[PDB]
Design a protein around this ligand. Structure first.
Ligand SMILES: *[C@@H]1O[C@H](CO)[C@@H](O[C@@H]2O[C@H](CO)[C@@H](O[C@@H]3O[C@H](CO)[C@@H](O)[C@H](O)[C@@H]3O)[C@H](O)[C@H]2NC(C)=O)[C@H](O)[C@H]1NC(C)=O
Ligand SMILES: *[C@@H]1O[C@H](CO)[C@@H](O)[C@H](O)[C@H]1NC(C)=O
Ligand SMILES: *[C@@H]1O[C@H](CO)[C@@H](O)[C@H](O)[C@H]1NC(C)=O
Ligand SMILES: *[C@@H]1O[C@H](CO)[C@@H](O)[C@H](O)[C@H]1NC(C)=O
Lengths: 141, 161, 161, 141
């Protein structure tokens, strides 16, 4: 899955995803990617977020909408993103998931649930300061 | 200003690049998102985006995609898109040509054909192989539970207990 | 304030009664919700639930339903379910027999048949008339936009200009 | 569409929906009903909610999830439901939609968007305090 958040220079935000799902999914299965608020969410008044991981689970917690909701109240992108991971973590401690957050001014962050097999999450960034697609990285909590 | 900004999941740099390029050419935030995601569909990023990957229990690759306009809060989305490669291209068309949010399955394939998309098999020798080795491992792993025969040991079809 | 509590949209009293009856017999909240909603599928509540209503552009009635367990936060859902009347019944089987959350279209039908559901036409003489009167009326209303011919005046097929 | 919320005697909550969609929808269209957080939402720690109306618009604002989110914060069921309608209202003043709310202790409420053709919303309630399902109504805001 690929989740992407883009903030135009004007301040207009857009978000999106594309995926082929999970291997050997039951015929007709649809994950979180095409679901607004789960796979991705964008609002010019707050910010945008995109999620990736086990959509069967993420879908039930609407991670992208909640991340944007936190940012709506002034929360820092990384914090809004970690808080989202923490709530799911309370229900499914072994869930595979990563979320990227960005507020209306251009600040970004990310978070992922730490598994023995998943300890760090990389994501690409590109803005004015960085004149090259910069691969960021975060340790899972 | 720190804007424009492009952020995407995973080390998919070519997708980030296509998105930035879309912006540089005076493209909209939406144009950028579509460009970035479509790039991974063509490239089959990690085999987790686009055709020729993640075959379902029947060996078929089906795609899901979405695109959202933060300004109007309009959303175009497709789920279980069959036989159409440009999933996010179709999702954007749901946004631009209907007042609906989500279209799914073979019905969505028909919609896509009306919008000019090409109907084509999403399988490849690679994905079929992936599927066959799966049949060989007795359909392990799978996502069934509480059915007969035991999903943890055998393949399907399954029936309720 | 006292429990149990059953609340539902619209004055569909029979659904309320059906849900309450399930709880009274010892059924769980999931049994109650399923019973109450299945009652409206059978009674075709307001023609906006179950078969024989809201035919699409091709005249086919497709159902959407979901059921959520608030304890485990497990969910079972189907969208664009075709040729199966008990939509919420299939949704519950998705919850109990898979680790997935949503199954759609003709693929969900196959799943439903595997779970014991009867594959049958969802049309009725009433929904067939509604569709033909709609066609005679030049397909008004519809949810298309930014296409030719003018969707506010004509039927499809449509296409972007 | 029918959206239903049930709170078992043991405090366990469940919610669900069933619908045939909207008349003359494009072949293959899926509304808010089967989407968690949109058509319905249930959480034993917060409460539950269910929505109905124009699904195309509703699913973009995740009404059931946000209503439950407010009650999680302490909001009275009615106020939680009203706040949800307002948020959407600012984006689409003429959208058709109604939401039912209920917190963990059995309190319920509802709200709807006022239209020339829709000024009141009727919903069924069945309490132990009541010996028959009684029809409640709320004036839309
Ligand atoms: C579920 O929703 C209901 C209705 O909003 C909540 O009930 C209200 O709870 C508060 C206590 O948090 C009650 O007000 C306090 O009432 C006592 C009465 O002795 C008074 O001493 C306090 O100064 C204050 O007024 C209020 O009466 C009560 N309302 C109703 C209609 O019962 C309930 O708390 C919610 N449950 C949860 C878990 O959030
Ligand atoms: C965006 O994030 C930064 C870092 O937390 C913060 O200082 C800034 O004020 C945020 N912008 C808004 C509008 O909240
Ligand atoms: C872009 O990334 C892919 C991996 O997804 C890589 O194989 C390819 O060489 C890169 N594109 C170009 C034009 O070099
Ligand atoms: C269910 O609803 C219809 C309309 O109110 C009514 O005629 C019917 O008798 C009700 N069901 C039963 C079992 O009475």
């Amino acid at each position: 899955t690929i989740g992407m958040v883009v903030i135009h220079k004007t301040g207009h935000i857009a978000a999106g995803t594309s995926t082929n799902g999970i291997k050997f999914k039951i015929h007709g299965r649809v994950g979180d990617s095409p679901i607004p608020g789960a796979g991705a969410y964008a609002d010019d008044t707050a910010g945008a977020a995109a999620a990736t991981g086990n959509g069967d689970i993420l879908m039930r917690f609407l991670p992208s909408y909640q991340a944007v909701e936190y940012m709506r109240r002034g929360e820092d992108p990384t914090i809004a993103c970690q808080k989202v991971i923490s709530r799911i973590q309370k229900h499914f401690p072994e869930f595979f998931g990563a979320v990227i957050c960005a507020n209306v001014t251009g600040s970004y962050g990310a978070a992922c649930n730490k598994l023995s097999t998943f300890t760090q999450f990389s994501f690409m960034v590109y803005n004015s300061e960085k004149n090259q697609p910069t691969e960021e990285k975060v340790d899972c909590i | 200003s720190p804007l424009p900004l492009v952020v995407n999941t995973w080390p998919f740099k070519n997708a980030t690049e296509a998105a930035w390029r879309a912006l540089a050419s005076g493209g909209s935030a939406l144009d950028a998102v579509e460009s970035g995601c479509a790039m991974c569909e063509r490239e089959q990023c990690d085999g987790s985006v686009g055709f020729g990957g993640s075959p379902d229990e029947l060996g078929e690759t089906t795609l899901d995609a979405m695109i959202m306009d933060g300004t109007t809060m309009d959303v175009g989305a497709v789920g279980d898109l069959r036989r159409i490669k440009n999933a996010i291209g179709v999702a954007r068309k749901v946004l631009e040509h209907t007042t609906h949010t989500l279209l799914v399955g073979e019905s969505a394939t028909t919609f896509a054909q009306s919008m000019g998309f090409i109907n084509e098999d999403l399988s490849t020798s690679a994905s079929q192989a992936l599927h066959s080795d799966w049949l060989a491992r007795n359909c392990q792993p799978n996502y069934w539970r509480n059915v007969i025969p035991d999903p943890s040991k055998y393949c399907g079809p399954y029936k309720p207990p």
